[PDB]
């Protein structure tokens, strides 16, 4: 048998249809993530990405930070996560400014309105996810 | 895009045209040499500047000269 074939039935495109690129499992995974899920406004995509990312980002600052062996470890980790979230939001805004200029807007992500909605959703979601993981980490003895 | 010039010390021995990998050069009729032809560069926008023509010239201080200039997506040889 042959499980590696030309990608999308074109033998001259620079990609291959390996069991990693074109499996049904990978299509179901990477067709249902927020950035690829069908029927999603850009704000909801940004929100769902942001909450997971904020949860993530408050992860490492609390445990490994300079004030880890301090009674104010979790607060300092939350503030560091907030600062990194603000930096990422600024990077998203300047990327949208440099990339999408003179665009028609709409529900497409590759436009000025779509990227502004995506950035707003990411920022509010990231701050919310950092706060939620702060609340769960402060009462970790419940579990 | 680079600029390619051919000077009148050409002998029409065609090696620059064969050495060209981008179809920049071609042979046009002429009357200033025994071969009756001189090289020409009508497609200098497809020049990449690799100077394979200048390696192939037999004349003392080569008649076909490539001057590196502005860079485009063709003269940089970018596939992406």
């Amino acid at each position: 048998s042959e499980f590696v074939k030309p990608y999308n039935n074109d033998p001259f495109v620079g990609n291959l249809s390996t069991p990693v690129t074109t499996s049904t499992a990978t299509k179901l995974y990477l067709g249902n993530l927020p950035i690829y899920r069908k029927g999603l406004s850009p704000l909801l995509r940004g929100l769902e990405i942001g909450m997971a990312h904020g949860y993530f980002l408050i992860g490492p600052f609390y445990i490994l930070g300079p004030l880890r062996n301090s009674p104010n470890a979790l607060l300092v980790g939350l503030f560091s996560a907030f600062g990194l979230i603000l930096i990422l939001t600024l990077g998203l805004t300047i990327y949208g400014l440099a990339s999408f200029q003179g665009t028609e807007g709409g529900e497409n992500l590759e436009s000025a309105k779509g990227w502004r909605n995506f950035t707003s959703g990411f920022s509010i979601g990231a701050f919310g996810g950092a706060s939620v993981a702060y609340v769960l980490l402060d009462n970790i003895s419940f579990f | 895009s680079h600029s390619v010039r051919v000077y009148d010390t050409c002998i029409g021995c065609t090696q620059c045209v064969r050495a060209c990998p981008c179809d920049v050069l071609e042979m046009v009729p002429w009357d200033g040499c025994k071969a009756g032809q001189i090289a020409s560069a009508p497609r200098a926008e497809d020049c990449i500047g690799c100077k394979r023509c200048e390696t192939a010239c037999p004349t003392d201080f080569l008649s076909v000269r490539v001057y590196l200039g502005s860079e485009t997506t063709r003269s940089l040889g970018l596939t992406y």
Binding site: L33, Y36, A98, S99 | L78, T79, Y80
Partner: protein
């Protein structure tokens, strides 16, 4: 060479030990073991496993200048072609991975040009040169007071 000569001669004169220079300056190993190896001891001991002192910043800048002088040799010895093919492979990698291929560059990434590479390697060489000689010439004189 000029600054090494001046610094070692004045280091021996200020300490009242000009005979050390007069005997050890005639051969290269005398320079290597009596100026550079001997006078680096207060510098490299700015911070160690037992603590640190006020010359820790000079030790850190000494290693900093070493690393910049070393990473100049990158651009000075390796030339464009290797890096252009590497950039092209990275371009394929970014264009053909999910999630991250939606982020698209405006300027096509290319390797540094030949003259630009020579300039960057030379600037690295020079900055590392200055930043590895200044901490030595300051901390060795500060670490001896003579």
């Amino acid at each position: 060479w000029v600054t090494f000569y001046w610094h070692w001669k004045h280091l021996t004169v200020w300490g009242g030990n000009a005979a050390a220079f007069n005997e050890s300056s005639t051969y290269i190993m005398g320079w290597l073991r009596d100026y550079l190896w001997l006078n680096s001891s207060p510098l490299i001991n700015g911070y160690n496993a037992f603590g640190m002192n006020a010359q820790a910043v000079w030790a850190w800048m000494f290693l900093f200048g070493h690393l910049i002088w070393a990473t100049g040799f990158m651009f000075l010895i390796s030339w464009r072609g290797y890096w252009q093919e590497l950039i092209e492979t990275l371009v394929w990698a970014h264009e053909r991975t999910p999630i991250a291929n939606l982020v698209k560059w405006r300027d096509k990434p290319v390797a540094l040009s030949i003259v630009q590479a020579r300039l960057v390697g030379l600037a690295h060489f020079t900055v590392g040169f200055i930043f590895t000689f200044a901490p030595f010439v300051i901390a060795s004189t500060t670490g001896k007071f003579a």
